[PDB]
Amino acid sequence: DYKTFDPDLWAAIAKEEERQEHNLELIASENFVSEAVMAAQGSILTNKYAEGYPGHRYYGGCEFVDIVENLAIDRAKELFGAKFANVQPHSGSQANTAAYLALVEPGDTILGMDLSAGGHLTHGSPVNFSGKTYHFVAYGVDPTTEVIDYNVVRILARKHQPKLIVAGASAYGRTIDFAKFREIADEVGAKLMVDMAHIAGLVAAGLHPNPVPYADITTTTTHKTLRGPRGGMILTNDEALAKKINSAVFPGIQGGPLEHVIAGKAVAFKEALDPAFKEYSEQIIANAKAMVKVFNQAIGTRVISGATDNHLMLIDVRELGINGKEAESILDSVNITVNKNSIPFETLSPFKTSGIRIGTPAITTRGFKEEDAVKVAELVVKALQAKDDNAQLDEVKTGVRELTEKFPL
Amino acid sequence: VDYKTFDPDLWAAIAKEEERQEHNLELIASENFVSEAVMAAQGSILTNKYAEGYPGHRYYGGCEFVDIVENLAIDRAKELFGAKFANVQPHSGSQANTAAYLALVEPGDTILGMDLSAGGHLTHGSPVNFSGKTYHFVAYGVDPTTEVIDYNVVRILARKHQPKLIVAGASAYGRTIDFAKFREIADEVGAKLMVDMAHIAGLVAAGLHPNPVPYADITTTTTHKTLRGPRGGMILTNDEALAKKINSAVFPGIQGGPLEHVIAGKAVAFKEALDPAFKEYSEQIIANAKAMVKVFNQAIGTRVISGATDNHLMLIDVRELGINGKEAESILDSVNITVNKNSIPFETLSPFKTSGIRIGTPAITTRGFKEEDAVKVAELVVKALQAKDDNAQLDEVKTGVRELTEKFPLH
Ligand SMILES: Cc1n[nH]c2c1[C@](c1cc(CO)cc(-c3ccccc3)c1)(C(C)C)C(C#N)=C(N)O2
Ligand SMILES: Cc1n[nH]c2c1[C@](c1cc(CO)cc(-c3ccccc3)c1)(C(C)C)C(C#N)=C(N)O2
Ligand SMILES: Cc1ncc(COP(=O)(O)O)c(CN[C@@H](CO)C(=O)O)c1O
Ligand SMILES: Cc1ncc(COP(=O)(O)O)c(CN[C@@H](CO)C(=O)O)c1O
């Protein structure tokens, strides 16, 4: 009824609802939040200005909003064991912006993971604030094993003498050894920052080593494997850093927090404390490993580094005679959503790429088990091997319909 | 009902905040009540979509319908303010201003911006904010006697300091801002002009405040103050080269994925503001504000900064009552009237004590308050602050608040 005033907007949202229902979402950074998370984001908390921190706000009327933010803060400490948490960052990018401000000065040397090797844009890309503001030096992966070589990282750190080392990634499927990163940073007198955005849910479930005890500052988003609303978060065990973090977020780089989104964070953090979340996180990894097995045994879908320890995988598609952009377009035509993605030592443009990234958090939330993840990987192989054969692409599109109807939203 | 069972802590707190919004007078000048549609958009499944890039130029697929939503927000923003280009992705007004500075100046450049005590925003050059840390801000303020901007003093400052950029706009300034004169001063010294119209955006949309968009190289705003939309930011320009720098600065410059469920809410609110009834709402905001100023002017103890309002807000120096702004804020909150303490021009107290409070009418006007009701609010505020903790008087104020909130219920 409130929809009648604006039929064009609500029609577009209606089609987006159907698109999420009918497509297989394999974008590693996406998920489906609960009804309760969306209700919190749709709450009247959007009306409240609440700059400052609980008990020390710059506006009247915040005494009940402060409960909501305290719940999000305290549940983050329960989930990750951090002594201090800041839940106001609007995004992972803002969380990383504030983390750097608390740790280094403009122009300082920072060692972070190269984008082609799997790092995030905010880990030193020259088109991002990170590369523009600080002197970033990149580390990568080994050309043959495509995993991090910690002796090479050590050599790099000693050569460049960074003030800060950043660990974490957007497209790295293997266990990150935070203990070794901390050893290297200590060796050269650098601080350590970990961006666990992609693996935060796995960390919360005990299925990836926890960076919080090792890093000066841990950042994360709330909307990937944590299955919360879109937003950021910063964690630390040092009260001196917590004060700099809090000042950097506000008044440093943000103004009013999004308290309806922070309520969604509180909701999602409590869901993550439930034992069911550990089973969900176990299923994520089992599903990713099952898919990786199919791609390892298929002709032309080369899995970067040959295995996965977490929720995602990179597929090199060069032997199929296509680039990542064409692989993404083929799979879209059969209702399978991935993203083109640079692979280690990428030689093509970042907008063409030699690969695609696939992750299992979203389909696992829909209910997919290992046999269903196997079927998904077989449909992906079939569609990419079907050199424009309309008969086989329609068979794949049929198999996708079978899966989406088997696991509705 | 069932999802609320899993988490009583969270949902009981939200229920208490619903009751507080219903039962209080919300006089925070930057707050409003958004429509059911706006909140439904924010509560939609668009929160699940990663959509980095811009409509038609995303970095990956599945964005066909998100592109429709974001283009609706862009197109209605263009129509609302008459701008040739809009960027609707900024997470907030602070992010909008961050990206606007990146499109206009280089780190270390000299910028003229309104002093915080004089009414400017933190992002207009405060040294504890990224603005004051990243650029060389020279502040202009208001005159000590009239408490309004002296444009000859701005011109003198501009000529003396040769700024690369002049910033106009305010958080706690109740008078009309003469954008034409800012453009004249910027042209004279060869500076660019940036206008942050967050507070007055809805008044501008309604033609009730001079429009900065024709005069400013870049105009920024929030969507949640007088525009009555979701919490977020927006950037406008008529220059195609600037529009490209703006888009690059927002992403991949300072943000990652946009909040498309919030952007859906921006589209909803922009169409609401395009309705003719939004003009009548905006007229009533100003008439209510002027009605309150007349009451505060007559009352001894509540000194209105500059003695008048041209827009939605007023700044009240409370020192003659023997209290500071923090004490006034907590007196009012104890009788269910919600304001914020606020520095006044040439503020002599700590920024966390302050000499004043700030009051605005957009929220109560959205509830349906007319000039008669606005007069009654101002009388209640005067009575609470003069009561010197006489509980007879304070309880009468609480009754008056309850009378008004029941006369004008939410939804
Ligand atoms: C958007 C983004 N932010 N951080 C990222 C991305 C990714 C991405 C994807 C693409 C696809 O056209 C381009 C870029 C890009 C990088 C530099 C310049 C221009 C474009 C980046 C992915 C994970 C979304 C990417 C890859 N590849 C990984 N490594 O990190
Ligand atoms: C939060 C904010 N952002 N931009 C603003 C604010 C205001 C505000 C209020 C307060 C209340 O104790 C303190 C500060 C403050 C300024 C500098 C350093 C430390 C604190 C600022 C108002 C509009 C919310 C304010 C005032 N006064 C001005 N004019 O603009
Ligand atoms: C490690 C890490 N840190 C930060 C961010 C940025 O989060 P934001 O999109 O909330 O700004 C991302 C987003 N990652 C997205 C691309 O932006 C992805 O598809 O993987 C990230 O992976
Ligand atoms: C002119 C202007 N520009 C920018 C911003 C920042 O918007 P944000 O809170 O969405 O970051 C504000 C916020 N204004 C708030 C204080 O932060 C207020 O209560 O007035 C503003 O007034």
Burial of B22 (0-12, 13-18, 19+ CB in 10 A): middle
Q: Is A125's C-beta closer than 6 angstroms to any atom of ligand 1? A: yes
Ligand nearest to the Cα of B172, by number: 2
Cβ-proximal residues to B85 (8 Å cutoff; 6+ apart), any chain: B78, B236, B237, B238, B239, B240, B242, B243, B246
Is A402 annotated as belonging to a binding site?
no
- Spell out a b/e string for A122-141, using b for 16 or more CB atoms within 10 Å of the CB, else e: bbbbeebbbbbbbebbbbbb
Nearest to A71 among B10, B122, B333 (CB): B10
In the residue annotation, B390 being an active-site residue is answered as no
Strands ordered across the beta sheet of B356-360: B303-304, B313-317, B356-360, B340-342
Q: Is B98 left (phi over 0), alpha (psi -120 to 50) or beta?
A: alpha
Residue-level length of chain A: 409
Q: Does A23 touch chain B (CB under 8 A)?
A: yes
Q: Does A243 touch chain B (CB under 8 A)?
A: no
Cβ-proximal residues to B135 (8 Å cutoff; 6+ apart), any chain: B101, B105, B107, B108, B109, B110, B111, B125
Helical H runs in A129-219?
A: 129-133, 150-160, 178-188, 200-204
Tokens found for residue B253: 């410059």
Ligand nearest to the Cα of B353, by number: 2
Asked if B203 contacts B226 with a C-beta cutoff of 8 angstroms, the reply is yes
Asked if A148 contacts A180 with a C-beta cutoff of 8 angstroms, the reply is no
Output the 3-class SS for chain B: CCHHHHCHHHHHHHHHHHHHHHHCEECCCCCCCCCHHHHHHHCCHHHHCCCCEECCEECCCCCHHHHHHHHHHHHHHHHHHCCCEEECCCCCHHHHHHHHHHHHCCCCCEEEEECCCCCCCHHHCCCCCHHHHHCEEEEECCCCCCCCCCHHHHHHHHHHHCCCEEEECCCCCCCCCCHHHHHHHHHHHCCEEEEECCCCHHHHHCCCCCCCCCCCCEEEEECCCCCCCCCCEEEEECCHHHHHHHHHHHHHHHCCCCCHHHHHHHHHHHHHHHCHHHHHHHHHHHHHHHHHHHHHHHCCCCEEHHHCCCCCEEEEECHHHCCCHHHHHHHHHHCCEECEEECCCCCCCCCCCCCEEEEECHHHHHHCCCHHHHHHHHHHHHHHHHCCCCHHHHHHHHHHHHHHHHHCCCC
Cβ-proximal residues to B211 (8 Å cutoff; 6+ apart), any chain: B81, B82, B179, B204
Q: Is A342's C-beta closer than 6 angstroms to any atom of ligand 1? A: yes
Is B126 annotated as belonging to a binding site?
no
Q: Is A209's C-beta closer than 6 angstroms to any atom of ligand 1? A: no
Tokens found for residue A289: 């490993």
| CATH number for the segment(s) A38-273 | 3.40.640.10
Q: Which residues of A are catalytic?
A: 49, 51, 195, 221, 224, 230
In the residue annotation, B52 being an active-site residue is answered as yes
**What residues of chain B lie within 8 A of the CB of A121, using their CB?**
252, 256
Cβ-proximal residues to B141 (8 Å cutoff; 6+ apart), any chain: B114, B115, B117, B118, B345, B346
CB contact under 8 A, A30 and B48: yes
**What residues of chain B lie within 8 A of the CB of A93, using their CB?**
254-256
Q: Is B114's C-beta closer than 6 angstroms to any atom of ligand 2? A: no
Give contacts of B 329-358 with A, CB under 8 A: 329-330, 332-333, 338-341
- Nearest Cα residue in chain B from A268: B7
Give contacts of A 152-181 with B, CB under 8 A: none
CB contact under 8 A, A42 and B47: no
> What is the distance in angstroms between the Cα of B178 and the nearest Cα belonging to chain A?
26
Query: Looking at ligand 2, which residue's alpha carbon is closest to its atom 11?
Result: A58
> What is the distance in angstroms between the Cα of B401 and the nearest Cα belonging to chain A?
15
**What residues of chain A lie within 8 A of the CB of B338, using their CB?**
59-61
In the residue annotation, B219 being an active-site residue is answered as no
Q: Does A70 touch chain B (CB under 8 A)?
A: no
**What residues of chain A lie within 8 A of the CB of B50, using their CB?**
27, 29-30
Q: Which atom of ligand 1 is nearest to the CA of A119?
A: 29
> Which CATH number is correct for B39-274, 3.40.640.10, 1.10.10.60, 2.40.110.10, 3.30.43.10?
3.40.640.10
CA dihedral B257, B262, B267, B272 (to 10 degrees): -160
Cβ-proximal residues to B170 (8 Å cutoff; 6+ apart), any chain: B114, B118, B119, B120, B121, B124, B177, B199
Is B23 annotated as belonging to a binding site?
no
The technique is X-ray
Is B240 annotated as belonging to a binding site?
yes
Asked if A311 contacts A288 with a C-beta cutoff of 8 angstroms, the reply is yes
Resolution in A: 1.9
Asked if A30 contacts B62 with a C-beta cutoff of 8 angstroms, the reply is no
Q: Is A9 helix (H, G, I), strand (E, B) or coil?
A: helix
Query: Looking at ligand 2, which residue's alpha carbon is closest to its atom 15?
Result: B351
